[PDB]
Ligand binder design. Structure first.
Ligand SMILES: CCCCCCCCCCCCCCCCCC(=O)OC[C@H](COP(=O)([O-])OCC(O)COP(=O)([O-])OC[C@@H](COC(=O)CCCCCCCCCCCCCCCCC)OC(=O)CCCCCCCCCCCCCCCCC)OC(=O)CCCCCCCCCCCCCCCCC
Ligand SMILES: CCCCCCCCCCCCCCCCCC(=O)OC[C@H](COP(=O)([O-])OCC(O)COP(=O)([O-])OC[C@@H](COC(=O)CCCCCCCCCCCCCCCCC)OC(=O)CCCCCCCCCCCCCCCCC)OC(=O)CCCCCCCCCCCCCCCCC
Ligand SMILES: CCCCCCCCCCCCCCCCCC(=O)OC[C@H](COP(=O)([O-])OCC(O)COP(=O)([O-])OC[C@@H](COC(=O)CCCCCCCCCCCCCCCCC)OC(=O)CCCCCCCCCCCCCCCCC)OC(=O)CCCCCCCCCCCCCCCCC
Ligand code: HEA
Ligand code: HEA
Ligand SMILES: CCCCCCCC/C=C\CCCCCCCC(=O)OC[C@H](COP(=O)(O)OCCN)OC(=O)CCCCCCC/C=C\CCCCCCCC
Ligand SMILES: CCCCCCCC/C=C\CCCCCCCC(=O)OC[C@H](COP(=O)(O)OCCN)OC(=O)CCCCCCC/C=C\CCCCCCCC
Ligand SMILES: CCCCCCCC/C=C\CCCCCCCC(=O)OC[C@H](COP(=O)(O)OCCN)OC(=O)CCCCCCC/C=C\CCCCCCCC
Ligand SMILES: CCCCCCCC/C=C\CCCCCCCC(=O)OC[C@H](COP(=O)(O)OCCN)OC(=O)CCCCCCC/C=C\CCCCCCCC
Ligand SMILES: [O-][O-]
Ligand SMILES: [Cu+2]
Ligand SMILES: [K+]
Lengths: 124, 60, 196, 459, 61, 76, 186, 103, 65
């Protein structure tokens, strides 16, 4: 349809490049940090690249913060079991901080015996 | 900033193909993407082999 | 056969040269159709009346030339000369001589391929057929293997289920002996507590 | 612009973003519940403020269902890929798509504002009268939120239905999943609106439908006539996602595509006629109970066919492909988890079993395994599959075996014990309980704190 | 009548086919944002006060 | 017919009749006119308006005899 | 600010120099008043059919759809080059112009309200006219009704004029104005 | 039609932007408050929002407070009734003409 | 334009201002507070304490603390 929204248009050329006064190319913000730590592992994974192709995807330690570089360096079945127990222990610790020294009377031996008497009478 | 792109003849700029006449035939050479090392960084060597295989279909 | 027979676009004529259907509000002017039929003559009647196109006689020699150069076109031109061409006859002439646009594959530029590559076409087709042969056979092979394996799961699920059947079986035996023999069952034992 | 954008893909991102935000409030409420239930006594809620707990459980349920999972699985992923799957330039109704997300946000603000300003009382997310109609103004505010949410849901359903008129390719299984959910909404929502209006009439217009000589059981019929179709409006989009992920990642064409599609249609029709399995203990007639029990058990047939068709998709896939991707793990975990939830659903479907297990934490664990585990994981798996297309970053999820393992283990620590206490029995919608149920409640509570900690590791 | 002189149909969104008139309507409603915030904030204060939520501390002092 | 509708017996207040949990104020949330009267209970409102008028507050309606007004459809 | 706002005109020369287009009227080309023209020819004033004069001002709209077509350049009055390019339009129109433009942007909503309000006024007249009248006696004593059931329940159908008079006298007794009114004889 | 160069040399020689510095888990805890209290664009947008929201809150607040106090004193007719009893006491008349009417 | 090809181009090209992310996290944090703050306020309103002491609604031993 003459004068309608074009099906295809070519991109205009990009705006002029900016140099610094000394000739250094002007750099712009980039959120791709080079984290500082001693880990240098490189993990590669065969990945689906459609139906008939694959791609060898690599993860580099320097692309990740220290915490992940440390964890991802160890064997999974060395870390995983320790982490599982640790998280569970921490949860219990957190839930015990608010009840330190709490001693309800219904959990004393005297109350425990009285319930046994009630159960005997009621054949519970 | 009203600026209609289409011209009087109802045309817009279009970039043509890379045409190369040869052997009594007009050919078009397709644009190949740059090496993945340039765009991703890793050097494209020692690539594991994943052969062509047609779709895994259930038979019978 | 579309829009109830009403043409989307149609010609209307007015006898008064200065008539305007939007400015005037008179009630005597009667509009005519493209053939000149007054609006007060219904369509059912006017469409039966035969209307033919009359060209000035100075055009007859031209219409004759057209018929001779294209003999298939002669019968329509003769009707027009003799004043026997209706609108339907004109439409038949119009659509009879309409031809479709032609595309030539020999004019299409081809993707670049070297002469070495062009000589390997049979080999690549040969590889493709063997890939399809191997695919089809593997489908039968895999279907047999995995659907047979699913039976192992049925048998494993039947063994594990039977374990609970046996527990349930023993449970019912125990229950039948509770009220009959179990010393845990006590009667004339619970006494009302009373209101506190 | 930000709020003016009509782009269907941008709006899809907004739906996911808002679901996570509102989700933070949802998870916080869940932590309050589990903390309280850690032992017997009062832990974080005073005995004089027990009305707050009733409000916490009510808002938890409502927000997670209508403001988090539904906007995420029926608004987020659908608005982003459906027009692409349909090889169409954009969504059929651009302006309607914009207002729908704005409506969701405005109804969320109303709800949370009502927490802050109104007296905090609760009547469950099922808003049973007469309790719902003898409450304070917070109930009125919640009703406004639901009605407003209903407007957004229906207009979004209209939007998806129009794709049939413009689809330029083949209706894939996922597209069928959304269309049927849209149909379920068009037929169920108008009934919900009517019963909600009657709740308002009794709250605000001195109506007498829910006082003596008026049957309160009437509400439960009309509510659940929408209620159960809602649970399938929330699961069917998840099924559609699972189908795409398994086929794509395993490089295997969907097996029994037409049976998958006809299974989704069947679940919808059946799901529209089984609502009274939520009303087994009211005292319905014997024949009614038998009808509903019979038809409820039938839903397993079409649901079972889909499960087995998924299994064969994963079977036989090439070994060379790495199988530790988070999206693949979540998709597989869904099959393993959904079977647990569905089987327990069949158990509760038997009405005589249901007498013992109605209004107990067994029901909780049942619908958590399907929604809190299955639906959440399906939404995560779908977003993860579209990470490249969506383009988000600054998270460590795509390949994180620790996150998947820890999530699976700890989520089961929360809800598996809730099946046990269902035969103990611990009623639902309570905060205090007998001392002999502490062990299992404590274990589940330890599971809740742990799951929250694992949510921090993704960043 | 020239087909190429109507490109404003797709170059400009329909909501702003009216030029300054349509831009003015949007701008006028934009001016009401903060007045709305004050009005809405007042309603929250009204409910908060009527529920005696400001006397939380004075109640127990 | 409506203009001369016959009087009907005063309803006995049965087991489930005339139940109220709160006053009628949905029409006037802030003013709360005729809180005891029902939305279209014309005779209750008339007596309620009379109280307001006796309290120096003007209210409109329920003052002209039907047969002395136009369009009443109650004239012989 | 700009000349156009200072001197509003419809379809003059030097529109671009004047800086703005203040008229939403589009089209023209009629040879007579109220005649067939091009464009839609809609405006707040001086368009359509004049009721007081009983005359047509502009012709029926010529839609830019299948039923019509484009407008010839001789009669185009809203140039898109000047109509668009809103850069710094607020300075060209000023504050009063901004208020004018906002008011003029709602012609569609104004057209609706002019067509919608009248029927609603009529409905409101029904309410007001009824509210003035004293309430009819909806109910009477339960016992007395059943002791004279036939007269009360069926009096209207047998003789409506006397039943109407009887009702009026009861209203005069129920509201204490019986000695202040003379009920016409039947 | 506009003509532009392939590149431009800027007048300054400051490399203001570039790759992110390595950050830890809690880097946001200090960087975010730093932006709020040290970046102009942030604290000018905060003050603008607070000032105008409060600015329009005052007139609504004043109106509602007067209205709320009035509503607690009684209904509209209870207010007019108190002024009627006062006028009856001032004149010592048991029944006085209604407002806007003569004796 | 090339800058307009991608939706949310600044974020996708990794040039966005970090404040946008901070606002998103802050908004989520505020949403979470809507469950905790009214809990504390309501507890104090009906009891006089912002949070209870575990099992302070039950009988406690003499040495309980
Ligand atoms: C005497 C009186 C007589 C009678 C008088 C009667 C008068 C009648 C008047 C009637 C009309 C009144 C109303 C007029 C409305 C006018 C609308 C209009 O035309 O605007 C055009 C106008 C166009 O602006 P512009 O002049 O061109 O320039 C705008 C700027 O350049 C900015 O450009 P931009 O638009 O690109 O930027 C927008 C965007 C820019 O983006 C950002 O700020 C950063 C990026 C996002 C950060 C992450 C946010 C979280 C993720 C959200 C994900 C979902 C998003 C969904 C889409 C957005 C929905 C809002 O940020 C925002 O402004 C909002 C972002 C989202 C906020 C909400 C996120 C969730 C927070 C949850 C917290 C609690 C839990 O629209 C806007 O841009 C602003 C619209 C504002 C509407 C506000 C409505 C708020 C309602 C809230 C609830 C109300 C009840 C309770 C309130 C309680 C208060 C205490
Ligand atoms: C010592 C010093 C003394 C000094 C003394 C000085 C004295 C000066 C005296 C001056 C007296 C002037 C008298 C003028 C008389 C004019 C009469 C007239 O026009 O007649 C109307 C009209 C004459 O028609 P015409 O000749 O074509 O029009 C002449 C122009 O109106 C003529 O007007 P124009 O050309 O100048 O301007 C055109 C336009 C100019 O208009 C304007 O300038 C208006 C501008 C308004 C701006 C709107 C802004 C909207 C947006 C606001 C923003 C909203 C959003 C805000 C939210 C926040 C935003 C952030 O005006 C109109 O079109 C006005 C409307 C006329 C038609 C009205 C139709 C009835 C409407 C009924 C529904 C409404 C009722 C409401 C009741 C209210 C209570 C009174 O006659 C009729 O309406 C005919 C009615 C026939 C009824 C037949 C019923 C048949 C039933 C059959 C049953 C079977
Ligand atoms: C479940 C959780 C865990 C999930 C784990 C799994 C996740 C899997 C992955 C999921 C991925 C989903 C898809 C993601 C797609 C992302 C696309 C994207 O980035 O779009 C670009 C979009 C915008 O980028 P852009 O294109 O550059 O936008 C430029 C702007 O339009 C224009 O720039 P501008 O600078 O001109 O912007 C305007 C700016 C201007 O901003 C400024 O000037 C800011 C100045 C600083 C203010 C800072 C806050 C100050 C607060 C003070 C508080 C004081 C309290 C005092 C208390 C005292 C008590 C005594 O803003 C405004 O003017 C309006 C801001 C409105 C929004 C913020 C509202 C905050 C809360 C308000 C609450 C109010 C309550 C009132 C109650 C009243 C009751 C009466 O990005 C964002 O908006 C940020 C998204 C960041 C996250 C993306 C997802 C990452 C992956 C997930 C991470 C985990 C998240 C977990 C949830 C959060 C947990 C907390
Ligand atoms: C998306 C969420 C979701 C899903 C999918 C389901 C699915 C099902 N639910 Fe639902 N249910 C809820 C969410 C959900 N439910 C919620 C939230 C409540 C409580 C609301 C409230 O009370 O407040 C609830 C409550 C609920 C009850 C109420 C119990 C009570 O109130 O005491 C019952 C009982 O009939 C029930 C039954 C079922 C059944 C029979 C299915 C079926 O769909 C399950 C089908 C799946 C399978 C059966 C497994 C897969 C199939 C096979 C492996 C084939 C082989 C299996 C067989 C042959 C049996 N549900
Ligand atoms: C889909 C809705 C949904 C979800 C996710 C959850 C999640 C959780 N729920 Fe659920 N819950 C309900 C819906 C949900 N719940 C309903 C409807 C009720 C009944 C209401 C009533 O009784 O009235 C209920 C009731 C309920 C109770 C009963 C309280 C009672 O009435 O006595 C308890 C505590 O035992 C509980 C705990 C939890 C926990 C610990 C989690 C989770 O925290 C477990 C851990 C999982 C996560 C923390 C991940 C969740 C993440 C997201 C949801 C965001 C996803 C977003 C994207 C992927 C973009 N829930
Ligand atoms: C006391 C309790 C009271 C409760 C009251 C509840 C009220 C519920 C009201 C629900 C209204 C739902 C209306 C839905 C209308 C149909 C939606 C639809 O598809 O409309 C499309 C159509 C145009 O499509 P485009 O997006 O522009 O497409 C452009 C490309 N061709 O949209 C319209 O014209 C809709 C106009 C009205 C807005 C409807 C949606 C927003 C909700 C409005 C609520 C209004 C009442 C409050
Ligand atoms: C989806 C659209 C079709 C839905 C059809 C649902 C019909 C299910 C039939 C269930 C049935 O047997 O009805 C019994 C059941 C009531 O049973 P009892 O309370 O025990 O009373 C029986 C004697 N007192 O019936 C109902 O509640 C019917 C509710 C009306 C459904 C109307 C749906 C309208 C859809 C449009
Ligand atoms: C939009 C709908 C607007 C409806 C306005 C009219 C409402 C109305 O008439 O309600 C009264 C009508 C009849 O009730 P009574 O007055 O007690 O009947 C006694 C007969 N002498 O019903 C009601 O009271 C219900 C009103 C519900 C809310 C209506 C507005 C929304
Ligand atoms: C400590 C609790 C967790 C804090 C946390 O993780 O906040 C993250 C969040 C987002 O920060 P980044 O992910 O670094 O985004 C900036 C661009 N990369 O940080 C903030 O919002 C900072 C302010 C948090 C206030 C919490 C109250
Ligand atoms: O609900 O199933
Ligand atoms: Cu159900
Ligand atoms: K507890």
């Amino acid at each position: 349809r003459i004068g309608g929204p074009p099906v295809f248009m070519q991109f205009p050329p990009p705006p002029p490049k900016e140099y610094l006064a000394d000739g250094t190319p002007k750099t712009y913000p980039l959120h791709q940090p080079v984290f500082d730590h001693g880990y240098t592992w490189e993990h590669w994974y065969m990945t689906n690249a459609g139906v008939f192709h694959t791609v060898y995807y690599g993860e580099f330690a320097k692309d990740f913060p220290w915490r992940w570089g440390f964890v991802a360096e160890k064997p999974f079945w060395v870390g995983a079991p320790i982490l599982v127990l640790g998280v569970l222990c921490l949860g219990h610790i957190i839930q015990t901080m608010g009840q330190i020294g709490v001693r309800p009377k219904r959990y004393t031996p005297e109350w425990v015996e009285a319930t046994k008497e009630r159960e005997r009478a009621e054949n519970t | 900033h009203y600026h209609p792109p289409i011209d009087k003849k109802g045309q817009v700029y279009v970039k043509g193909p890379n045409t190369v006449i040869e052997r009594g035939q007009t050919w078009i050479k397709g644009y190949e993407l740059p090496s993945m090392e340039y765009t991703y960084g890793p050097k494209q060597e020692d690539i594991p082999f994943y052969p062509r295989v047609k779709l895994n279909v259930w038979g019978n | 056969a579309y829009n109830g027979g009403y043409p989307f676009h149609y010609v209307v004529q007015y006898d008064d040269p200065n008539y305007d259907c939007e400015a005037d509000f008179e009630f005597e002017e009667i509009p005519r159709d493209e053939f000149g039929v007054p609006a007060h003559i219904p369509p059912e009647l006017s469409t039966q009346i035969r209307h033919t196109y009359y060209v000035p006689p100075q055009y007859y020699p031209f219409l004759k030339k057209l018929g001779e150069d294209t003999p298939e076109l002669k019968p329509y031109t003769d009707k027009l000369i003799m004043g026997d061409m209706t609108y339907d006859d004109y439409e038949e002439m119009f659509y009879k001589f309409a031809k479709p646009l032609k595309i030539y594959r020999s004019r299409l530029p081809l993707p670049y391929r070297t002469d070495e590559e062009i000589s390997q076409e049979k080999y690549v087709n040969w590889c493709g057929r063997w890939y399809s042969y191997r695919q089809r056979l593997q489908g039968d092979y895999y279907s047999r293997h995995y659907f047979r394996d699913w039976l192992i799961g049925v048998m494993l699920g039947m063994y594990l289920g039977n374990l609970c059947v046996q527990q349930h079986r023993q449970y019912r035996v125990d229950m039948k002996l509770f009220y009959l023999e179990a010393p845990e069952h006590k009667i004339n034992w619970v006494k009302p507590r009373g209101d506190l | 612009f930000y709020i003016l954008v009509n782009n269907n893909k941008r709006i899809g991102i907004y739906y996911i973003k808002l679901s996570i935000i509102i989700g933070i409030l949802g998870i916080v409420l869940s932590y309050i519940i589990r903390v309280e239930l850690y032992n017997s006594g009062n832990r974080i809620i005073k005995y004089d403020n027990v009305n707050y707990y009733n409000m916490v459980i009510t808002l938890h349920g409502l927000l997670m269902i209508f403001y988090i999972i539904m906007p995420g699985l029926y608004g987020g992923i659908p608005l982003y890929i459906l027009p692409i799957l349909s090889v169409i330039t954009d969504i059929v109704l651009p302006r309607i798509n914009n207002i729908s997300i704005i409506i969701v946000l405005i109804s969320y603000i109303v709800v949370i504002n009502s927490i802050v300003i109104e007296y905090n009382i609760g009547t469950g997310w099922t808003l049973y009268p007469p309790l719902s109609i003898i409450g304070t103004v917070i109930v009125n505010m919640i009703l406004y939120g639901l009605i407003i949410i209903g407007i957004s849901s229906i207009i979004s359903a209209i939007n998806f239905m129009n794709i049939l008129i413009v689809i330029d390719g083949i209706i894939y299984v996922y597209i069928w999943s959304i269309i049927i959910t849209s149909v379920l909404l068009i037929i169920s929502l108008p009934i919900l609106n009517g019963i909600l209006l009657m709740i308002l009439s009794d709250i605000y217009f001195n109506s007498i439908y829910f006082i003596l000589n008026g049957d309160v059981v009437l509400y439960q019929h009309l509510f659940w006539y929408f209620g159960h179709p809602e649970v399938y409006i929330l699961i069917l989009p998840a099924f559609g996602i699972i189908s795409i992920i398994l086929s794509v990642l395993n490089n295997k064409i969907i097996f029994g595509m037409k049976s998958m599609i006809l299974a989704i249609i069947m679940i919808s029709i059946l799901g529209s006629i089984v609502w009274a399995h939520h009303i087994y203990t009211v005292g319905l007639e014997l024949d009614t109970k038998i009808y509903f029990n019979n038809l409820t058990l039938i839903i397993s047939i079409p649901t079972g066919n889909k499960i087995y068709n998924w299994i064969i998709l994963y079977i036989g896939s090439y070994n060379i492909l790495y199988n530790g991707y988070q999206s693949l793990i979540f998709s597989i975990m869904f099959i393993i988890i959904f079977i647990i939830g569905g089987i327990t659903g069949i158990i509760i479907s038997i009405d005589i079993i249901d007498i013992g297990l109605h209004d107990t934490y067994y029901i909780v664990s049942h619908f958590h395994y399907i929604l809190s585990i299955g639906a959440v994981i399906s939404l995560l798996a779908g977003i993860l599959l579209l990470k490249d297309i969506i383009g988000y970053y600054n998270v460590i999820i795509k390949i994180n075996k620790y996150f998947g393992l820890l999530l699976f283990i700890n989520i089961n620590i929360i809800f598996t014990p809730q099946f046990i206490i269902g035969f103990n029995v611990m009623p639902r919608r309570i905060l205090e309980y007998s001392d002999n149920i502490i062990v299992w409640n404590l274990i589940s509570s330890i599971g809740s704190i742990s799951t929250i900690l694992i949510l921090l590791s993704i960043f | 009548i020239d087909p190429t002189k109507n490109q404003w149909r797709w170059c400009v969104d329909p909501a702003w086919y009216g030029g300054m008139r349509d831009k003015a309507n949007m701008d006028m409603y934009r001016l009401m944002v903060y007045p709305f915030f004050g009005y809405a904030l007042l309603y929250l204060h009204s409910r908060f006060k009527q529920n005696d939520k400001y006397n939380v501390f004075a109640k127990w002092r | 017919h409506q203009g001369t509708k016959p009087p009907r017996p005063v309803s006995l207040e049965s087991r489930f009749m005339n139940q109220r949990r709160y006053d009628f104020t949905w029409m006037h949330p802030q003013d709360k006119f005729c809180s005891e009267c029902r939305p279209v209970e014309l005779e209750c409102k008339k007596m309620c308006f009379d109280r307001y008028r006796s309290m120096d507050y003007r209210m409109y309606g329920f003052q002209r005899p039907r047969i002395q007004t136009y369009y009443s459809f109650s004239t012989c | 600010g700009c000349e156009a706002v200072k001197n509003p005109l419809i379809g003059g020369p030097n529109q671009k120099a004047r800086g703005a287009i203040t008229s939403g009227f589009a089209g023209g080309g009629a040879k007579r008043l109220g005649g067939k023209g091009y464009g839609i020819m809609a405006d707040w004033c001086d368009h359509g059919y004049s009721f007081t004069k009983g005359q047509a001002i502009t012709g029926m709209p010529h839609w830019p759809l299948w039923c019509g077509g484009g407008v010839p350049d001789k009669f185009i009055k809203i140039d898109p080059d000047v109509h668009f390019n809103l850069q710094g339009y607020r300075e060209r129109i000023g504050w009063y112009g901004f208020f004018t433009a906002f008011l003029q942007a709602n012609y569609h909503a104004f057209v609706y309200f002019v067509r919608f309000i009248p029927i609603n006024i009529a409905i409101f007249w029904i309410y007001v006219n009824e509210r003035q009248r004293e309430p009819q006696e909806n109910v009477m004593d339960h016992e007395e009704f059943f002791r004279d059931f036939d007269s009360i329940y069926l009096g209207q159908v047998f003789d409506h004029h006397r039943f109407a008079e009887w009702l009026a006298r009861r209203r005069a007794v129920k509201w204490g104005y019986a000695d202040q009114i003379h009920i016409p004889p039947v | 039609g506009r003509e532009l160069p392939e590149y431009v040399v800027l007048p300054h020689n400051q490399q203001r932007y570039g790759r992110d510095k390595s950050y830890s888990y809690f880097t946001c805890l200090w960087h975010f408050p730093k932006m709020v209290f040290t970046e102009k664009w942030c604290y000018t947008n905060i003050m603008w929002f607070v000032f105008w929201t409060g600015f329009w809150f005052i007139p609504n607040y004043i109106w509602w407070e007067r209205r709320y106090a009035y509503q607690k004193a009684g209904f509209h007719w209870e207010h007019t009734n108190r002024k009627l009893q006062a006028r009856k006491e001032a004149l010592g008349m048991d029944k006085v003409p209604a407002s806007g009417m003569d004796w | 334009n090339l800058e307009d090809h991608f939706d949310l181009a600044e974020y996708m090209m990794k040039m966005h201002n970090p404040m946008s992310e901070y606002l998103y996290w802050i908004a989520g944090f505020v949403s979470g507070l809507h469950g905790i703050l009214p809990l504390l306020h309501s507890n104090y309103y009906f009891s006089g304490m912002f949070l209870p002491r575990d099992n302070d609604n039950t009988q406690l031993c003499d040495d309980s603390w």
